């Protein structure tokens, strides 16, 4: 049940079975990658498509 | 097993340095943690090293 403390409104949503939660920086592939980093990656989405 | 040190006493002056080495009887791999009875009077570095 999410509440916005800037406009005082209530809303709900679903989460993927969270035992915990926190904030952290993402992996290098999502922390800002570089063209000359995908030296081993190819267009055959080797287990990575959501980019 | 039992541990021994070749050094048991030393005479120093303020400003002089010295290095001691720990060596157990067996040649296995173990962890080290140095201690001091009276705080101060000395400065240590890398206490986890032999």
């Amino acid at each position: 049940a999410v509440w916005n403390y800037e406009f005082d409104t209530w809303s709900f949503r679903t989460i993927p079975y969270a035992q915990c939660i926190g904030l952290v920086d993402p992996p290098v592939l999502e922390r800002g990658p570089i063209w000359s980093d995908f030296q081993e990656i190819t267009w055959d989405d080797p287990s990575i498509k959501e980019l | 097993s039992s541990v021994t040190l070749d050094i048991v006493s030393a005479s120093l002056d303020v400003g002089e340095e010295i290095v001691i080495t720990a060596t157990a009887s067996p040649e296995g791999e173990y962890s080290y943690q140095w201690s001091v009875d009276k705080t101060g009077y000395v400065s240590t570095t890398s206490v986890t090293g032999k």
Binding site: - | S1, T4, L5, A10, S11, L12, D13, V14, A22, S31
Partner: protein, 100 residues
Amino acid sequence: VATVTKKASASIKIYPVVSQIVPKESTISMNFNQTKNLEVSLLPADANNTNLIWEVSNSSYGSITVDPSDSKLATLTSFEKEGNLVVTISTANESVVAQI
């Protein structure tokens, strides 16, 4: 977790550092005649646990201005010339440099 632990005894002795600091001089200055070789009398702070080195600037006021101190002190000489100089009684290596 540590299943087994073994201790090692090791003693250390730190000689006193008191009185090793800059010493004090009784004869801060001593004027002599042209070619007089009056001996020098002085002691550092308790003269304990360390030695010193007697140095003199412009070591040209005598064939042997100040010879190596026998045990703690040395002698002094003079030459047939005037001028101002300084005698630095420096310790072995510590930052202790006096002046006479």
